Amino acid sequence: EVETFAFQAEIAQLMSLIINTFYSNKEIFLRELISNSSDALDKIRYESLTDPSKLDSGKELHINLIPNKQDRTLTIVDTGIGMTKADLINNLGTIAKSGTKAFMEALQAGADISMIGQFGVGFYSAYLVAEKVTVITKHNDDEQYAWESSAGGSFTVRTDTGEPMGRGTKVILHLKEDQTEYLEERRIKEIVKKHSQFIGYPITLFVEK
């Protein structure tokens, strides 16, 4: 049972700008997604200080990057706090409503796309390299959910029937045909070292077989 929702007007406007604007420095998408994973890990880590049972769904706090050349997908897995259904449908879109508006004003005052993280809406930079984004997420207080969008102004949410993750968020980037360089091992390593060297959680790059 799949529910279809319309993006908020400002968010849909940002996604169209991110997809249609000529901008060559696309690698920053990884910095933003990794930074988002780091925030989610900070959150579950801080909650576990006063409530250790919040880690019963998984003690390890890490970030995995999983390129897949046959499916042309790049997956970023974190064991962070995860997202509830209300987050996927309401709360995150409400918070991003104002950050998108501010980011758009700045883009006309001289700012460029690489500053998107300063407005809390870095997640949508995924559409620099992806034609479709799938998010599998599990929060301690909710069921496992699957969020998906190919832009166009709508997204879908459904309960995920696949493999249980215990706790965290899986971001699956279905890459555009011309962005397969982000599936190469030495390219991902160069980007992580350049932009995410100081992330305070272990980042593991799965090599393919």
Ligand SMILES: NC(=S)Nc1ccc(F)c(Cl)c1
């Ligand atoms: N940084 C932001 S606004 N992230 C975000 C918003 C809505 C979503 F459904 C997902 Cl998966 C992520």
